[PDB]
Amino acid sequence: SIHSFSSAFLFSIEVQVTIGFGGRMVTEECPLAILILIVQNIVGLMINAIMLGCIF
Amino acid sequence: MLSRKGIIPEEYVLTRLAEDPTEPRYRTRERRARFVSKKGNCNVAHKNIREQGRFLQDVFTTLVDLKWPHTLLIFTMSFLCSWLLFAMVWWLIAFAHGDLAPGEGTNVPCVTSIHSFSSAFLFSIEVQVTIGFGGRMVTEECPLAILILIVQNIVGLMINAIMLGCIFMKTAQAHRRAETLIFSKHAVITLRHGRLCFMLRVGDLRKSMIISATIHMQVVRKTTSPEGEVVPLHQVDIPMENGVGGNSIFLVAPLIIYHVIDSNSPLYDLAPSDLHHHQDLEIIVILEGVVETTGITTQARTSYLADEILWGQRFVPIVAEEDGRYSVDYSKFGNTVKVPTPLCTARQLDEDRSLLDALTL
Amino acid sequence: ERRARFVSKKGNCNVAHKNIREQGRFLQDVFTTLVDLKWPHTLLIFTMSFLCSWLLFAMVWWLIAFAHGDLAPGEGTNVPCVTSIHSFSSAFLFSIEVQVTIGFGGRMVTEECPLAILILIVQNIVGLMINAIMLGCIFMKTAQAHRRAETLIFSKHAVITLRHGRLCFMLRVGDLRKSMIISATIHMQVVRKTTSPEGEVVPLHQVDIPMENGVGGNSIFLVAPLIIYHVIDSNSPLYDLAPSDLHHHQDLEIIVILEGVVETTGITTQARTSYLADEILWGQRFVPIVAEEDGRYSVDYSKFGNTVKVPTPLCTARQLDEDRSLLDALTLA
Amino acid sequence: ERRARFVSKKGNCNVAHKNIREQGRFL
Amino acid sequence: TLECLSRSTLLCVSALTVISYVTPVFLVALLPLAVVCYFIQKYFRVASRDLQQLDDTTQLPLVSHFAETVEGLTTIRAFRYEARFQQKLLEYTDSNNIASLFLTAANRWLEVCMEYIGACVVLIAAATSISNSLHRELSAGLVGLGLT
Amino acid sequence: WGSQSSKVHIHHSTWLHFPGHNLRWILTFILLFVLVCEIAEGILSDGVTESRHLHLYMPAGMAFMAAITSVVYYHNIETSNFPKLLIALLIYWTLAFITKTIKFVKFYDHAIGFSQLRFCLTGLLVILYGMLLLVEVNVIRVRRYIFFKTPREVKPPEDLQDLGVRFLQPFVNLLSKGTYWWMNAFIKTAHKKPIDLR
Amino acid sequence: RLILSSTFRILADLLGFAGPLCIFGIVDHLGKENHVFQPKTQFLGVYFVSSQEFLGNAYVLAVLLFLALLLQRTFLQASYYVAIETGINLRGAIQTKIY
Amino acid sequence: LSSVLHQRAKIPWRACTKYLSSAGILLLSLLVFSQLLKHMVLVAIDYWLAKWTD
Numbered sequence A: 001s002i003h004s005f006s007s008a009f010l011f012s013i014e015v016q017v018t019i020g021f022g023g024r025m026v027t028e029e030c031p032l033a034i035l036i037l038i039v040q041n042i043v044g045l046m047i048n049a050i051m052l053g054c055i056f
Numbered sequence B: 001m002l003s004r005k006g007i008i009p010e011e012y013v014l015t016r017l018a019e020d021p022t023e024p025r026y027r028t029r030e031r032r033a034r035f036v037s038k039k040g041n042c043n044v045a046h047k048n049i050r051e052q053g054r055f056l057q058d059v060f061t062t063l064v065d066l067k068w069p070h071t072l073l074i075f076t077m078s079f080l081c082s083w084l085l086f087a088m089v090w091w092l093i094a095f096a097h098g099d100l101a102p103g104e105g106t107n108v109p110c111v112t113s114i115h116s117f118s119s120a121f122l123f124s125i126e127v128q129v130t131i132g133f134g135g136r137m138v139t140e141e142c143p144l145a146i147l148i149l150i151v152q153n154i155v156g157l158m159i160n161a162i163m164l165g166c167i168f169m170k171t172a173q174a175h176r177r178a179e180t181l182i183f184s185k186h187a188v189i190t191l192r193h194g195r196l197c198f199m200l201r202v203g204d205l206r207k208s209m210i211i212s213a214t215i216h217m218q219v220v221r222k223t224t225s226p227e228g229e230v231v232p233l234h235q236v237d238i239p240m241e242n243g244v245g246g247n248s249i250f251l252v253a254p255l256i257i258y259h260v261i262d263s264n265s266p267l268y269d270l271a272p273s274d275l276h277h278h279q280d281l282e283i284i285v286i287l288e289g290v291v292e293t294t295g296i297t298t299q300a301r302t303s304y305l306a307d308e309i310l311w312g313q314r315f316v317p318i319v320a321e322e323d324g325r326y327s328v329d330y331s332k333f334g335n336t337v338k339v340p341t342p343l344c345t346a347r348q349l350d351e352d353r354s355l356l357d358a359l360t361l
Numbered sequence C: 001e002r003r004a005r006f007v008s009k010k011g012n013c014n015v016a017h018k019n020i021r022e023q024g025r026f027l028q029d030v031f032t033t034l035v036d037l038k039w040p041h042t043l044l045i046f047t048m049s050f051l052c053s054w055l056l057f058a059m060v061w062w063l064i065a066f067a068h069g070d071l072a073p074g075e076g077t078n079v080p081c082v083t084s085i086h087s088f089s090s091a092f093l094f095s096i097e098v099q100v101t102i103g104f105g106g107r108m109v110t111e112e113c114p115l116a117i118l119i120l121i122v123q124n125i126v127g128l129m130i131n132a133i134m135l136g137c138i139f140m141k142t143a144q145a146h147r148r149a150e151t152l153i154f155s156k157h158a159v160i161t162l163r164h165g166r167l168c169f170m171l172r173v174g175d176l177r178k179s180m181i182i183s184a185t186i187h188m189q190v191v192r193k194t195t196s197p198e199g200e201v202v203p204l205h206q207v208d209i210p211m212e213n214g215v216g217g218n219s220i221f222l223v224a225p226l227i228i229y230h231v232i233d234s235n236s237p238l239y240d241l242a243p244s245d246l247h248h249h250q251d252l253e254i255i256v257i258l259e260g261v262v263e264t265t266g267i268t269t270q271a272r273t274s275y276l277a278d279e280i281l282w283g284q285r286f287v288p289i290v291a292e293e294d295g296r297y298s299v300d301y302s303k304f305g306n307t308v309k310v311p312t313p314l315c316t317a318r319q320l321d322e323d324r325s326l327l328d329a330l331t332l333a
Numbered sequence D: 001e002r003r004a005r006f007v008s009k010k011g012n013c014n015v016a017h018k019n020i021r022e023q024g025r026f027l
Numbered sequence E: 001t002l003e004c005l006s007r008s009t010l011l012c013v014s015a016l017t018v019i020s021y022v023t024p025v026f027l028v029a030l031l032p033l034a035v036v037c038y039f040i041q042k043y044f045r046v047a048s049r050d051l052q053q054l055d056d057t058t059q060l061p062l063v064s065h066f067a068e069t070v071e072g073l074t075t076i077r078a079f080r081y082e083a084r085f086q087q088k089l090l091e092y093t094d095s096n097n098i099a100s101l102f103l104t105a106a107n108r109w110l111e112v113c114m115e116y117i118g119a120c121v122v123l124i125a126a127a128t129s130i131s132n133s134l135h136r137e138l139s140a141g142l143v144g145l146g147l148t
Numbered sequence F: 001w002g003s004q005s006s007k008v009h010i011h012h013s014t015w016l017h018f019p020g021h022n023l024r025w026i027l028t029f030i031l032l033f034v035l036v037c038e039i040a041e042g043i044l045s046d047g048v049t050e051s052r053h054l055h056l057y058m059p060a061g062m063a064f065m066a067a068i069t070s071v072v073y074y075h076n077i078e079t080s081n082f083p084k085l086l087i088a089l090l091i092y093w094t095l096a097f098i099t100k101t102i103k104f105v106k107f108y109d110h111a112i113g114f115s116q117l118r119f120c121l122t123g124l125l126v127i128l129y130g131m132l133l134l135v136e137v138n139v140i141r142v143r144r145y146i147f148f149k150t151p152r153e154v155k156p157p158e159d160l161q162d163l164g165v166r167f168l169q170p171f172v173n174l175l176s177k178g179t180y181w182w183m184n185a186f187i188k189t190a191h192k193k194p195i196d197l198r
Numbered sequence G: 001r002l003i004l005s006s007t008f009r010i011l012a013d014l015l016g017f018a019g020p021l022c023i024f025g026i027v028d029h030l031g032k033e034n035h036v037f038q039p040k041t042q043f044l045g046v047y048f049v050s051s052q053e054f055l056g057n058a059y060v061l062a063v064l065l066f067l068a069l070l071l072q073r074t075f076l077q078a079s080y081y082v083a084i085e086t087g088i089n090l091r092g093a094i095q096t097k098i099y
Numbered sequence H: 001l002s003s004v005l006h007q008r009a010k011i012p013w014r015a016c017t018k019y020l021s022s023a024g025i026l027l028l029s030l031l032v033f034s035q036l037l038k039h040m041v042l043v044a045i046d047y048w049l050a051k052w053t054d
């Protein structure tokens, strides 16, 4: 369910915000998407944690 | 094999009396060690530390201590090791139930959409990171899967909690602020109010005030007792000559810090020749006080060796007054204009002054 | 069964409290207790709190689905409220997916029965509250520096030696970690069943004892082992101790307290120890230990608590002072 | 008003630091 | 030592040229390994020179002490002072033994590291030669020379 | 590795080798060799099939990495006399042993026999794990930290207690005495500061 | 100590004789008419390699040679050091007894 | 500083004054070239052995 950069931008939202709807999945096919998924999850967690700390 | 070092085991004693190369003489000229370096960073190397496990038990001290690139390695590897281990478990259990065998039957799989270890790893991503893609569901089929889902959820929440704690205590560090306090490269001695004192200058750069500031001051010198008790580093405290009697200081402008050399001060027998390049002597200035924003106590370590102490100079007046508000010209921070002063010792000066006063009166 | 230390050698204040009219405040103070719990017990309460919340809300979801009847099998005769619910196990998985915000999707909440919306809102609020509370306990738990207290380390047994004429109760305290403990502060107390002319009895009296610092203050700066010596003058209550009166079961104890905020976290930490009379030695000296190799410094922690001897007069502090007073008077005359 | 207060009546330390050899301490 | 040094270094050059000729891929791995080999050789020289000179300067006083005691054996026993000279002898022998032990230990460190380099060369040469032989029908004979 | 970048303590620290240290290392090596052998079998067996058959060597491929990490983890805990931390490593051995023992007896179900290589390698690896587990519980038997009584720990040897013992050959982890790895840092000093009787 | 030195040396010599034997094995199977075939033995879904056949793939013999060279060229050095250390201790004891 | 660098010298100056003085242009051209020829024959004999076995 990737069609245009609108869809891709929505998908990045759903991963980093951890909304995770389900229409836009990551499959088993290309290992680079799983690599990017790990990178985005870790970067998202780091930024969320750092912004938490600054807010505290 | 091909060497001739074992063929001849004999020796000749005719050649001897070889010495005086003069090469090691230049090596002895190497500068001696400083107690604490200028930018803090105390230069003490502990030896024969018996670890006894007191350097792994306090794990969460270490995690905050480590540098950011190392902390991100631990961050990333903690999460990824957890993800991959639980992915292994999901793969194995969904394989034991047979859901991995393609076209097994109408038996309802205990986790849908598990058709690889790749999808198993993606499923671990979805569960632990709490992303929940609709493709990989957890069905009500086998009790072990629900147990493992509970365990992974609790472990993921615990790992997130731990990393949140360490990021909290690291984003409120202090060593990024200790370096923004400025001392002089060298300190000066000069008479104020007819009495000899050891001046110094310290200032702040960031606008953020430093609250409840505190300036300890110590002399580091090997010193013996009349009983022969030899102390290699016999630190001695020194009052800051602050009028109130406390050592606290309100640091906005670059202030002049000094200790009046009365009969108590251990510098009571210094001479301008007694503080030359290689003299064994060192002053420490511990500037404490919290950071106003984060409320984290800090230190600003610094030292002054003998070959940095300079006799008979006064700090250039740094503060001026602009049109509406004061001015601070930090370029004149450490400049010490020459000022003539008596070149005798503190004891000789005191005795001479007392004798002259007695004769006059 | 002979003498009980007030505090143990490595902290753990050894006074057994008793006969408390416990108002229940101790169990009413939950957050402090949770932070003081050992990690395995914290994990157990953590796990039991989450599991109870999950399973309680799972019971509610199953009960409402049962009331709406969608768990009774039906093909098209019903419009479900909470989809895919077809057993209690399904409701438990649903509670997991909502509270931990996993949202697997196959178990949706529809618009039909509004009590599901109310319970969804309550569960979201409760999960956020429980996550917030458990995060708070973990944050304060990881800020603990009770572990750090096991690197402020004192010498095993301190000695009484002369220095510059008079007599001081020395000691040696050092640091093992690499960090620097800010605003360190050392107190030193003597413990004895002191009595008064009026007949007052104080079964364990504590008297503060000066650290004989030059500036006249408590604060100290601790990068290497130090010698914390209390100068015994006429004011001190060790002014009348005889070396013969320093046997094992003497009614004495020297509490030592070392404070100072940790720099990595910003937490204030004590460092306690005591020294019974047996653990006090007379007229001995601590061996100089801070060796200086060229280009650096060193500390030979092997000899951290290894002492040797030196001849000193075996007379009380008062006897020493009075005898030196008579000698000075004779010299003046 | 030709008089410069060192700190104003609301905290507000009324000093202007100048000629700081900045090393990125803002960032 | 000139003859043996020339023999050793030129046998090394002979061996390396033959390995490269038999298995041309080996030079791609020769460059990193040689650089690592270089560092070991460089560091060892700096150490070994010092230790060798130290060993020699240590042994000279030792024999001197022995000889001088043969002079004044009666004089040394006259003062009943021979406990001090026993401790002097033990110190001298300790210094000589520690110098020689470090020398032997540095010797063994160089040999272990250099023979590990040679073992890595063996694996690389064997893998490349076998791979080429099976895939490219390379002559078996050249494989034998490369290995030996 | 994070404390290591600021290990001035380990700059001149002290060590204490746990009992059965020699037998621990020689067993790790005697199983690293047969794990390389198992890897050779795995790469060799699948040469007849048109699928890679990862389940012949990747198990051993991670066993080799696991063993290396195990020995690294044991040396780290050996420098810092903190034995309570090896409980995880302890359970690993027994847990690993149990699983592989099942595989062994399963071959006995089908009458595989020593005539097949995998049975020989698996049997040898199983007895090696038994001996290694014996070592892991030997540590418990001596130091008794899990036992009821106080841990009967010993202090570091007085030979290394002295500051001036800079020839660490008698007491160094067995895989830094065959290859004289402790020499390496000293040689750096030789380049930096001349090696004299100091 | 000296017995340990000599035992390490003997095992180093034995293991060292692999090099020649491994070279013979590699070349012999790599020049055996240039015939390339599979193991040709199967058992219950996975091929089970036998004793000699594991010495078949010249890669295996070369890797085993590499391991043998590591063990040889570490045992041999261990033998050198033990003999050398005992020798340095014999000089110490003799140089004290003579004095 | 200066002591370290001077100590860290391989002394090719000494090797040059040693060899080139005595050997001149004849003995060196005999010694060195004989070594090169000897080792080239060693490589060649191994190579010929290989080709003959093949």
Ligand SMILES: CCCCCCCCCCCCCCCCCC(=O)OC[C@H](COP(=O)(O)OC[C@H](N)C(=O)O)OC(=O)CCCCCCCCCCCCCCCCC
Pocket: B057, B058, B059, B151, B154, B155, B158, B159, B162, C035, C036, C037, C038, C039, C040, C041, C043, C047, C141, C144, C146, C147
């Ligand atoms: C069901 C799944 C739940 C999910 C949990 C797994 C999640 C794993 C990721 C988290 C890894 C984090 C590791 C941190 C460990 C730190 C250990 C440490 O430094 O202290 C070890 C501690 C013991 O002292 P303390 O609690 O610190 O002392 C109290 C102090 N005053 C304080 O304020 O902190 O505590 C210990 O010594 C134990 C160390 C932790 C090791 C866990 C082993 C499990 C033991 C299970 C049996 C428990 C039996 C309990 C009996 C009573 C124990 C007192």
Ligand SMILES: CCCCCCCCCCCCCCCCCC(=O)OC[C@H](COP(=O)(O)OC[C@H](N)C(=O)O)OC(=O)CCCCCCCCCCCCCCCCC
Pocket: F022, F026, F029, F030, F031, F032, F033, F034, F170, F174, F177, F178, F179, G004, G067, G070, G071, G074, G075, G078
């Ligand atoms: C399945 C087949 C695989 C084939 C490969 C097998 C490899 C196995 C190697 C096993 C080595 C066996 C001997 C171990 C015993 C050592 C001797 C020993 O116990 O003494 C240790 C001594 C020092 O101790 P000490 O306290 O001063 O004296 C003893 C004490 N005083 C007493 O009472 O007596 O000091 C010593 O004597 C130490 C000797 C050091 C020896 C170093 C060599 C070890 C091998 C290194 C190999 C490197 C890598 C190999 C990888 C192989 C696979 C990849």
Ligand SMILES: CCOc1cc(CC(=O)N[C@@H](CC(C)C)c2ccccc2N2CCCCC2)ccc1C(=O)O
Pocket: B001, B002, B003, B004, B005, B006, B007, E103, E104, E107, E108, G080, G084
């Ligand atoms: C100071 C001498 O301490 C050592 C002692 C030894 C042990 C040893 O067998 N030596 C003699 C051998 C005998 C036959 C003279 C030798 C000397 C020169 C060149 C090679 C060799 N052989 C060595 C063994 C293999 C064949 C060639 C090794 C190395 C050293 C060392 O410098 O560290």
Ligand SMILES: Nc1ncnc2c1ncn2[C@@H]1O[C@H](COP(=O)(O)OP(=O)(O)OP(=O)(O)O)[C@@H](O)[C@H]1O
Pocket: B182, B183, B184, B185, B186, B330, B331, B332, B333, B334, B335, D019, D020, D021, D022
């Ligand atoms: N204006 C300034 N900005 C930043 N750091 C300063 C400033 N003035 C002094 N320092 C600090 O004081 C120390 C002295 O270093 P430096 O030699 O550059 O100055 P100096 O000799 O005191 O002369 P000056 O005050 O003219 O710069 C350094 O740690 C330096 O960072």
Ligand SMILES: Nc1ncnc2c1ncn2[C@@H]1O[C@H](COP(=O)(O)OP(=O)(O)OP(=O)(O)O)[C@@H](O)[C@H]1O
Pocket: C019, C020, C021, C022
């Ligand atoms: N055992 C106790 N535990 C806790 N608090 C106590 C205890 N005894 C007294 N207090 C506290 O001391 C204060 C005195 O209150 P209260 O009059 O009830 O006691 P009291 O007169 O000291 O008792 P008692 O007659 O036992 O000495 C209160 O603040 C009470 O909470």
Ligand SMILES: Nc1ncnc2c1ncn2[C@@H]1O[C@H](COP(=O)(O)OP(=O)(O)OP(=O)(O)O)[C@@H](O)[C@H]1O
Pocket: B048, B049, B050, B051, C153, C154, C155, C156, C157, C176, C301, C302, C303, C304, C305, C306
């Ligand atoms: N090298 C060291 N590294 C760290 N702490 C040390 C070291 N040596 C001693 N200590 C600690 O110093 C304190 C007293 O040590 P001291 O040397 O005086 O006696 P000890 O015989 O080592 O004592 P104990 O039996 O309690 O360990 C103890 O807390 C001890 O753990």
Ligand SMILES: [K+]
Pocket: A017, A018, A019, B129, B130, B131, C100, C101, C102
């Ligand atoms: K979520």
